Design a protein around this nucleic acid. Structure first.
Ligand SMILES: [Mg+2]
Ligand SMILES: [Mg+2]
Ligand SMILES: [Mg+2]
Ligand SMILES: [Mg+2]
Ligand SMILES: [Mg+2]
Ligand SMILES: [Zn+2]
Lengths: 206, 102, 64, 78, 129, 150
RNA sequence: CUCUAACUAUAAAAAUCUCUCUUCUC
């Protein structure tokens, strides 16, 4: 589509119609919408990005964490252990591989799968420590939608991590399985299982 | 030494008054050293006034109040936050704490 | 059933709890916007969020 | 120094003719092919997982979506 | 009157295990006694507002099945020589009763208050804690 | 293989006294295997664990051993159980031990039979267990009768 | 220089401690 001539020949696919910014030049941010109304404005699929890698000051003020691209937040939460703590290009590669794998299984543009899994795997009611030592219990309270996004990302990455640990499957494949299972309500997913159990426990301690 | 010229009792000319019991700890304490608080409140709080008004027959019910004079002891009164320790130059003042709201 | 309801905060009534990590807000329903509750949140909130509640009769009581 | 897992060989270290007709029969009908997916069915050791996985790029039995190292992403040819 | 079949809600809220006990106008006929401890596990959150909430929902469902559509609240504290201040649960019990469709008429407080009779429990120095 | 709960349903009933073998503990509570029934885990809340005040989790839990239990709430769509240990009376634990011992004897006998015949324990229960429990009310009493009256 | 209104509401357990004390004048 109108290949611009230059002394340096950028590939045609990189030149085709680039007013249509894609995540990895593969997935469209349009067609992706948030089903839940509570967690909108805390999932940042609205802005376009050419890479899930941006050196953004997303930890200076209080609430800029929401404005970070959701895929970028997933990448940042993947790089979580002492053995692999600063490595983020590896996290970007893992997320990219997960996105292609999710595209393979039930095409369902993988950004929508990511969003739906994050919506489903976030708890809606939690507990806090209120017991005065001798009479110590848990106490049922509600969760902030930002903390819902944070917690959903957290359990998704934890489940992928302990699925990949000393296992044949790669981290990308385990993350893709967890995301696919959390797209639906399949209890086989670890994140959705923790969500269900935590909500049940909060129900038990009204 | 005298911490209180009134001795806290507020008796001054009786010798003996009839004691009353604490509402929390049931302390047999004289009726004048039995710091009293007249709790007058609504039988339905402001949190449920709208709900009751919408779901009640007899349009514009008077919503009657509840009255109870609480006879605390003094240890509970210190602990249950009813009465507070004061400066020795502030102990002089006996007026209630300046009209909580006008 | 699944009586999941939504509630948009109109004001935040400080932060409560022995931990000091929970907050208290005044939420108003997406429906019938003249009907409000006071509710406890465990996480960062501000004027504009939409909490998800599995209850509606509950009212927040200060945690001590 | 434990003995809890009690794992068997559980892996075809060398491919066999019946296993070859297997890998070829569900060379299609596996709508996503990778090293871990191939060894998930007990029929590949894991080193020959790559061998059979690269061999299927002979007559276009499967198509590549990405060929980055450390893994592979293949879909059924349509 | 549009044939609002009436009862008396007659909530009894002590400092533990509040009671919700609806009856007809006479009061000699008892229906839907379900209490606060009827519906909670901790054996001590019987006085909690949630226990009274659940009990109120149950009595509302039962009486709505019965035919009674409006109730008369008779709030009673533990009464007698005790604290005789209304329990924490009964307030939420009344709120939940007014929530579940039932109409509300003639709220009354019927706590038994004595004429300084029958010396209180606890001894002269009372409960030391 | 050990499966096929003794009683009428794989999922439990309401307020049925249960019979636990604890496996691990998380922060929220203890997920415990149920040995009275087939295999399904139960959740014992921390606040609903001990008669005394909670001070030592591992002193009372005793990971790897069996104990008494009571069921409070059940889930009849996918399988979940809420359990308590504080609310067990002084006398009920005796009937719990005797029921455990008799049910475990029956389980061991029929597992021996299944291991000898290499047929799933569920099929052998299909042919032996619950028609016997329907006839006599207890498979062990009927076993004693079969010892006496064939 | 003129006025009488709003309201709540927690109590788990925590015993004990050995030396040795030393000037202020222009
Ligand atoms: Mg190193
Ligand atoms: Mg003194
Ligand atoms: Mg005084
Ligand atoms: Mg005189
Ligand atoms: Mg004291
Ligand atoms: Zn007192």
């Amino acid at each position: 589509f109108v290949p611009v001539e230059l002394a340096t020949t950028i590939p045609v696919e990189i030149q085709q119609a680039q007013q249509e910014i894609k995540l990895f030049n593969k997935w469209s941010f349009e067609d992706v919408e948030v089903k839940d109304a509570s967690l909108v404005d805390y999932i940042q699929i609205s802005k376009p990005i050419y890479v899930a890698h941006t050196a953004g000051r997303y930890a200076n003020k209080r609430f800029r964490k929401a404005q970070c691209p959701i895929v970028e937040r997933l990448t940042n939460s993947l790089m979580m252990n002492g053995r692999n703590n600063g490595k983020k290009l590896k996290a970007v590669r893992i997320v990219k591989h997960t996105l292609e794998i999710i595209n393979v299984l039930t095409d369902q543009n993988p950004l929508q799968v990511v969003v739906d899994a994050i919506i489903n795997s976030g708890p809606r009611e939690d507990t806090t420590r209120v017991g005065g030592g001798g009479a110590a219990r848990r106490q049922a309270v509600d969760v902030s939608p930002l903390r819902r996004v944070n917690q959903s990302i957290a359990l998704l990455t934890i489940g992928a991590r302990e699925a990949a640990f000393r296992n044949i499957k790669t981290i990308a494949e385990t993350l893709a399985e967890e995301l696919i299972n959390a797209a639906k309500g399949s209890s086989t997913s670890y994140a959705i299982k923790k969500k269900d159990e935590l909500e049940r426990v909060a129900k038990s301690n009204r | 030494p005298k911490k209180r010229a009134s001795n806290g009792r507020n008796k001054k000319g009786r010798g003996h008054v009839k004691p009353v019991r604490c509402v929390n700890c049931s302390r047999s304490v004289p009726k004048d050293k039995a710091i009293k608080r007249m709790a007058i409140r609504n039988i339905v709080e402001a949190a449920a006034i709208r709900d009751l008004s919408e779901a009640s027959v007899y349009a514009e019910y008077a919503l009657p109040k509840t009255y109870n004079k609480l006879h605390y002891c003094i240890s509970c009164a210190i602990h249950a936050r009813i009465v507070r320790v004061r400066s020795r130059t502030d102990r002089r003042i006996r007026a209630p704490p300046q009209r909580p709201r006008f | 059933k699944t009586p999941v309801t939504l509630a948009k905060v109109i004001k935040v009534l400080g932060r409560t709890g022995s931990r000091g990590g929970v907050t208290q807000v005044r939420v108003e329903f997406l429906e019938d916007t003249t009907r409000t509750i006071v509710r406890n949140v465990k996480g960062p909130v501000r004027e504009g969020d939409i909490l998800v509640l599995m209850e509606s009769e509950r009212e927040a009581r200060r945690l001590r | 120094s434990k003995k809890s897992h009690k794992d068997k060989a559980k892996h075809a270290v060398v491919l066999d003719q019946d296993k070859f007709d297997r890998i070829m029969k569900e060379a299609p009908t596996y709508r996503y092919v990778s090293v871990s997916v191939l060894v998930d069915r007990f029929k590949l050791g894991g080193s020959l997982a790559r061998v059979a996985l690269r061999h299927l790029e002979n007559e276009g039995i499967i198509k590549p979506v990405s060929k980055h190292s450390k893994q592979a992403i293949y879909t059924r040819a349509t | 009157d549009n044939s609002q079949v009436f009862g008396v809600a007659r909530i009894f809220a002590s400092f533990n295990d509040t009671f919700v006990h609806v009856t007809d106008l006479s009061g000699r006929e008892t229906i839907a006694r379900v209490t606060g401890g009827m519906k909670v596990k901790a054996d001590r959150d019987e006085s909690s507002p949630y226990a009274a909430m659940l009990a109120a929902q149950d009595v509302a469902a039962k009486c709505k099945e019965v035919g009674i559509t409006a109730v008369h609240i008779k709030i009673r504290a533990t009464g007698g020589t005790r604290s005789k201040t209304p329990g924490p649960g009964g307030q939420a019990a009344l709120r939940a009763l007014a929530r579940s469709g039932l109409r509300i008429g003639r709220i009354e407080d019927v706590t038994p208050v004595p004429s300084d009779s029958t010396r209180k429990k606890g001894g002269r120095r009372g409960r030391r804690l | 293989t050990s499966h096929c709960r003794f009683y009428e349903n794989k999922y439990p009933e309401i307020d049925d006294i249960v019979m636990v073998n604890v496996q691990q503990i998380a922060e929220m509570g203890a997920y415990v295997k149920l040995l009275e029934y087939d295999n399904i885990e139960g959740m014992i809340l921390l606040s609903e664990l001990s008669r005394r005040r909670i001070r030592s989790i591992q002193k009372l839990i005793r990971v790897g051993k069996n104990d008494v239990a009571v069921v409070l709430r059940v889930d009849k769509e996918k399988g979940y159980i809420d359990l308590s240990k504080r609310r067990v009376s002084s006398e009920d634990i005796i009937k719990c031990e005797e029921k455990y011992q008799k049910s475990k004897t029956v389980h061991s006998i029929l597992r021996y039979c299944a291991e000898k015949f290499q047929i799933p324990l569920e099929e052998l229960y299909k042919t032996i267990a619950w028609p016997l429990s329907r006839k006599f009310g207890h498979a062990y009493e009927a076993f004693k009768l079969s010892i006496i009256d064939e």
